[PDB]
Amino acid sequence: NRPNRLIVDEAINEDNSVVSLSQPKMDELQLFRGDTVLLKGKKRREAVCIVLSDDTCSDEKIRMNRVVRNNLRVRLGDVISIQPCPDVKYGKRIHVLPIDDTVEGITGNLFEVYLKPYFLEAYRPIRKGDIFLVRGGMRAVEFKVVETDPSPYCIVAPDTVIHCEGEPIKREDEEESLNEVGYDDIGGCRKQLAQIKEMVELPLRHPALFKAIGVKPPRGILLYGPPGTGKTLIARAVANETGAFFFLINGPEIMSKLAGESESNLRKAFEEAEKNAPAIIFIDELDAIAPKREKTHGEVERRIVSQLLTLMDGLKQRAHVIVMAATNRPNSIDPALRRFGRFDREVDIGIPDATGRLEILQIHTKNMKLADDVDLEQVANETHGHVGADLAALCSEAALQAIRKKMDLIDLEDETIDAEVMNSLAVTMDDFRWALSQSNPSALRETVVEVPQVTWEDIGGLEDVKRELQELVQYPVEHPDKFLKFGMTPSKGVLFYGPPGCGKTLLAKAIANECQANFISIKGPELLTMWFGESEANVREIFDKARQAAPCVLFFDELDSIAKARGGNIGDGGGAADRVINQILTEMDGMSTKKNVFIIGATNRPDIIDPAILRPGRLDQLIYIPLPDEKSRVAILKANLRKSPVAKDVDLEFLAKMTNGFSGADLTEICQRACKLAIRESIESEIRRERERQTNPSAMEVEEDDPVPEIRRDHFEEAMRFARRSVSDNDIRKYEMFAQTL
Amino acid sequence: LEFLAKMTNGFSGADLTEICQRACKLAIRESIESEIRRERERQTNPSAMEVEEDDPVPEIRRDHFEEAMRFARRSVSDNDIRKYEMFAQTLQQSRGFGSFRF
C-alpha cells in the first residue's frame, strides 16, 4: 500500500451504532445481505456484523464505528487493503460458551436471566465468541491461546447456550502480562521489535522463503544484551500483538522436580516444533530452569548450556521458542546464541534515551493522571540515560509517593477517601521529581549510559584539538572519497608539553562524549612498559580491545610516562629492555590501524619518549591536536573556590601571572594546598573561639564562615614562597623555541 | 612525474614513500571538502565554492612536494651502505670462478 500513514477521524454519521456499509464493499466485492465488510484484527481476530445496507440510496463515506473500532482494535488511519491472508480457518459446528463472569455475582440463577436476553435483543448474531455487555469487573475479554490443540474457527448456533469451562478470567485480557515497566516508543527498540516480528512471520508464514534459502537448521531468535531489565519480561505486548499459533500445547512436565525430565521435555519441545507450527511460547523461569553454565561448576549448568546448544542446533525455523535479551544470566547466557540462530547476528537494541522515558511517561499519563502540568520533558531529561523498566518503575514510584503525600497533606483520608480529592491531589511535577530523586532507577547510576569523563567545555579551549577531532569525524563520514583519492587517513599521536594533568585524557573524553564514543582512555606506562614483557604484549592487548570496541580511541597519553624509562642493560634485563623498545617501535610502526588509536603523549623533551617518533621517522605526520591557550588553571581554581569558601578580594590575575607555566593541573595543586591551609586556619580559629567561649560564656565568637572568609591571599602567597615556580623563564623560552622550530 | 624524478636524484625508496605520504596528507588537508565546504559550512552556500575542486593531488604542485622534501630527511648513510654493499660484492667476486668448460 501507500508508504505514508494517516489517522482516521470519527465517523461521518452522528450515530455510533449506525455503521453504514460502504458502497465499495458491495461493488468491488459481492457483499450479500447476510454479510458485511469483514474487519481484520490482531492475533487472528475477525468480526462481521449482519446489517442491511442500501448502496443505491446513499454512499456515506463515514469512518468506523466506536464499538466496531473497539471490538476490532483497528488502528487509527490504517491502510485498509485486501492482501493474501493464509491464517484463516473454518468450521461446521461450535459450542457458544457463555461468559463465566456474568454467571457469578448475579442473584439467583444467572443462566435464566442470560438466556432470557440471549434469544431476543442480544446484539449478537448466531456465532461463537460473541461478547455481551455485563455489569461489574471493569475489564475486557480478549484471550489468546499460546498453543491450542483444536482450531478456533467454527460456526455456532445461538439457540443453544453451551456451558463454559467454569473458570472465570481474573486477568485483564486487554492489557499484557509482561513488559509492565519495560515499555518504550516501540517496545524498547523499534529495530529489534521489527526483526523479531519478521522472524516470527517469515519463518511461520513464508516457509517457502526458508526452503529456497535452505536454512532449515536455523533455530530463530535468541537475543542477548538487554539482560536483567524489564526487557527480560518483554515477551507480552510484543508477542501478544503478534499473537500465538495453535496445536502442540506442551508436554506433560508435571513432576515438580524434573531432574533429567526437565532436559527430556525441553528436547521434546525442541524436536516437536521442528516439524510443527507451534507458537514461540516464552520459557517461564528460563534462567532458573536453565542455569546455562552460570549457576554451578558441577553438571546442571553445563548440561543446561549443552541442551540450549542442541535445541538451537536441533530446531527448525518454525517456532523458535527462545528467550531474548535476558534469556539466561548475562554473565553466562544459554548456548542458544552460541549454537545456530544468533551465532552470526546481534540484536539491534535501542539505548536508554529520552525517547523511552517519554514513552513510559506517556503510558503512565494514559494509565493515571500524573499532574495537571506534569513536565514530562523534565522527567525524560532527568532519566535520559535510564529508559525502560527502570524509568517507568521510578516514575510510578515517584508518582505514588507524591500522590500519597498530597493525600496525607490534604486531610487524614481515614473516614471517606474522596476520589475527587485523590485525582485532584495529582502527583505534582515538582513533587514527582522530588520523589524520583529520593527514589532511584534499576541501574546503579543514571549517568553511566554515556562515555564522558569531561565535558567539551570542561576542556578549556582545545580549538584546534576540537577542529582535528571534528575533521576526523567528518572527512571519514563526510568526504571519505576525498581521503581515498587523496590516499590514506592521517597518522595519530600528539605530543603535549608542560606539566602533567594536561587534560589530554579529559579533552579526549570530552571529544568522545561529543562524538558519542567510548575512547579507550589508556594509561601511561601501560602500553610501552608492558607488564607482560615487551611493549608488544600491551600493544596487542590494546589492539584486541580496539577491535572489539571500535572505535575505541586508544588515548595512550603521557608517552614520557608510557616509556617509564625502564633501562637496566645488565644480563637478561638489558635484553628485556631492548625487546620492549623494539616492540614499542614495531607497535608505532604498525598496529590495529582502526578504532582511531590516537596516542597523545607527553613531550618532556625531544628524546624523552621515542625520539625516532619525535623525529619524522616513525610518524609520517605527528598530528598534535593544538589547544587554545587559556588561564584554565585560574578558571579551575575559581570553580574549586566556589565549591569551597573563598570570596571578596581575589587578586587571581595578580597571582596567576606569577606562575603562568601551568598545564591545567599544574597550578591546581597550589590552589588545593592554599585551600587546605585556609581550611586548617579556619578550623584553628574555630577551635580557639570555642575554647574562649568555654572559658567564658561571653568571650569570643566566630568572625565568618572562615578565619579568612575571603581568598587566603596571604596563605596562598606563603604557600607559593614555600613552594617554587614550575619552570624558569629562560627554560620556558627555550622550550617554546624548540616547539616552534620543529 | 619527470620533474619529481629529476628532483629525487636517486633519493631513498623509503624516503620516496615518505615524501609520497607527506604530499598525500598535504593534499588531503588542502582538500576543498576539508577546506572550502567547512569554510562556507552551508551558511549562504553549502560549500565555499559552487563546484567541487579537483582530486586532492590536483594541484599539489612542485611547491608542496619541495616543502615536504625540505622537511624530509632522505639522509641514508651513503658511505656506510656503500661500504656494506662493496664488501658483499667483493666477497661474491672472490667467491666466483671461471667457466671451466671442457
UniProtKB/Swiss-Prot annotation, chain A:
Chain residues that bind ATP 2: G501, C502, G503, K504, T505, L506
Effect of D159R: No effect on binding to DERL1
MF GO annotations: ADP binding; ATP binding; ATP hydrolysis activity; BAT3 complex binding; deubiquitinase activator activity; identical protein binding; K48-linked polyubiquitin modification-dependent protein binding; lipid binding
Consequence when changing K504Q: Impairs ERAD degradation of HMGCR
InterPro entries per the UniProt record, alphabetical: AAA+_ATPase, AAA_ATPase_CDC48, AAA_ATPase_domain, AAA_lid_3, Asp_de-COase-like_dom_sf, ATPase_AAA_core, ATPase_AAA_CS, Cdc48_dom2
Outcome of mutating E165K: In CMT2Y; normal ATPase activity; impaired autophagic function
Taxonomic superkingdom: Eukaryota
Subcellular location: Cytoplasm, Cytosol; Endoplasmic reticulum; Nucleus; Cytoplasm, Stress granule
Matching SUPFAM superfamilies: ADC-like (SSF50692), Cdc48 domain 2-like (SSF54585), P-loop containing nucleoside triphosphate hydrolases (SSF52540)
Classification via Pfam families: AAA (PF00004), AAA_lid_3 (PF17862), CDC48_2 (PF02933), CDC48_N (PF02359)
Region (Disordered): 688-707
Modified residues (N6,N6,N6-trimethyllysine): K295
Domain writeup: The PIM (PUB-interaction motif) motif mediates interaction with the PUB domain of RNF31.
Family: Belongs to the AAA ATPase family.
Linked pathology: Inclusion body myopathy with early-onset Paget disease with or without frontotemporal dementia 1: An autosomal dominant disease characterized by disabling muscle weakness clinically resembling to limb girdle muscular dystrophy, osteolytic bone lesions consistent with Paget disease, and premature frontotemporal dementia. Clinical features show incomplete penetrance. Frontotemporal dementia and/or amyotrophic lateral sclerosis 6: A neurodegenerative disorder characterized by frontotemporal dementia and/or amyotrophic lateral sclerosis in affected individuals. There is high intrafamilial variation. Frontotemporal dementia (FTD) is characterized by frontal and temporal lobe atrophy associated with neuronal loss, gliosis, and dementia. Patients exhibit progressive changes in social, behavioral, and/or language function.
Protein name in the entry: Transitional endoplasmic reticulum ATPase
